[PDB]
Amino acid sequence: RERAGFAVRDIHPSHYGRICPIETPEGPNAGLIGSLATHARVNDYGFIETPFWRVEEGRVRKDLAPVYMTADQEDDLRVAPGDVATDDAGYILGTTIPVRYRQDFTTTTPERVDYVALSPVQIISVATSLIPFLEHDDANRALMGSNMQRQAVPLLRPERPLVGTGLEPQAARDSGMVITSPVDGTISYVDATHIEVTADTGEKYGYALQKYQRSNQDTCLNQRPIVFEGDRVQRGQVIADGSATEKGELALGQNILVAYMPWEGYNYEDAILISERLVYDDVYTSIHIEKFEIEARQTKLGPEEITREIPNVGEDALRQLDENGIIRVGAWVESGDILVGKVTPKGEARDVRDNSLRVPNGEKGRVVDVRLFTREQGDELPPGANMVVRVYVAQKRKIQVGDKMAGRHGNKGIISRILPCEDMPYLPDGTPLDIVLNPLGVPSRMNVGQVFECMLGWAGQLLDARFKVTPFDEMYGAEASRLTVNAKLSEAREQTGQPWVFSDDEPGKIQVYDGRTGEPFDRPVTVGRAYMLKLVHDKIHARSTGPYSLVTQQPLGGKAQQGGQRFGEMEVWALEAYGAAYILQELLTVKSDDMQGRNEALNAIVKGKAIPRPGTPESFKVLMRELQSLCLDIAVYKASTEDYEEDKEVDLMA
């Protein structure tokens, strides 16, 4: 990381069709981790290749097979992009065609073009290929949307986009969570955990479905069947689906009613205002499973025992244990609830000590699995352990204030208010909106594609249709996206019969009323159906007093161990610029490592007295000891008051 510089982290003209120029991390890893493009492949030497169609006399030969080519090969040829338009059969239309020759962009007559890229999405990765109307977005927001599409959370009931891009059914068939029938027959047994299909004339095939498992990121890996019993099924037809797929294809978010307008300050600077329907309709609710672990070890005093004979506890807190000291499957555990009961043989009957495992503060849910592993059962336990108990706790999370919501075009936000559906703006038919987004964030971020999808999604809802628009769709016309959206909206208006759906004066805008007063807003606003995602991650943390570090006696860092917040040197500078001296001195000594002043301050606060003056923090004494241990005679001195006296060395370590 320290050796990689500006040159390495950039885009090289040889990445065209082999490495995505969009999908990267942000921060210290920007440009150092990349993603393979959609059509790129690696040959047996280790070089990335990419496919092309041959062009003979200006005719694209799609009859012949794609010719793959590496970066060095395609330097002497004139290669055209995948967005060039050809007529019937294969001839290239136009008089000037953009080509790449020797890592440069030029234009040539379409009789001197050697190769043409296979698809318009050959230059981007799979995550960036799932963004509709991508050519109307900035590249930074395209990066944001592609990165945030991989942080979406599988929801309770997933749903396909209405303005999908065409790669959704292909991005889900490789993860190996969708089950398709390889056989053109009938379905004979359907169950929540099993599917069976009998070939028209042949053997029976049986599939088992994963149910409420757990991923590396605590999400749920469910699998559900789609078909019903006694159903005619064709080969290659979807039979079961994953936790983020609807019927074959990826489904990471939900389609909701959106309006672009400011609320009473709740849309301010990327904040999001949503409706309460997203809470009680179980939109944007997900299942998260966590794993807790307890270990029975062998101490020098003796071994540790898992039992319900826990000290200093009443029978009101041992209700859900299984007469072996371990909680039962299907029990609701709240915060601080005991999961596994353990006793340690302390040395000082009334001798056992309690270190039973409990739910962390801020965690609740159902217990779904309690697996036990002991050396007797033939399991590979750790070197010094005698019982490993693992407990899985599942919970359902709803959308709430503080959660992150996102779109495919780079628009992120944090929910700041959840309004009752009689306070949200509503349509000329009485339908309250689901989400209100600030339009102030659209023109400064140049992610105009979100304003196209919404509108097309609106049409898709009204026409009971689903649109598959592919990126860079303007090779067919001068403004293809706008014309398609306008035509679809007009068709929806004619089919539905409601004239308020689409207006010719303001195409994408319709009248919206105020749920609080019933008065319409001064001007019509843009409403549509938007496909929004709920992002992962449990960040709220607070501390008063907890564990401390070994050498410096300063509070530990980390949510899982009651850690403190770091007061770096920039914050010290900020407090110095304010003129603060007592806040700074209290932060540096009494609240961090004044080993004796911490207890005095806490006792004074509890008793209600005044906090006494601090002393020397422990890190300074540690540093002086380390400097003395480096053969330095550094010391602290008190100056002599009178004339004929020597300065006296002060003993800090007392």
């Binding site: 007093t545 907890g546 401390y548 050498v551 006696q553 530990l556 806490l602």
Partner: peptide, 17 residues
């Protein structure tokens, strides 16, 4: 991140005094 920054210290918690 190092292992030594995840180990608590032996002592009486200010709260338990």
């Amino acid at each position: 991140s190092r292992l030594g920054d995840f180990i608590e210290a032996d002592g009486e918690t200010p709260e338990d005094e």
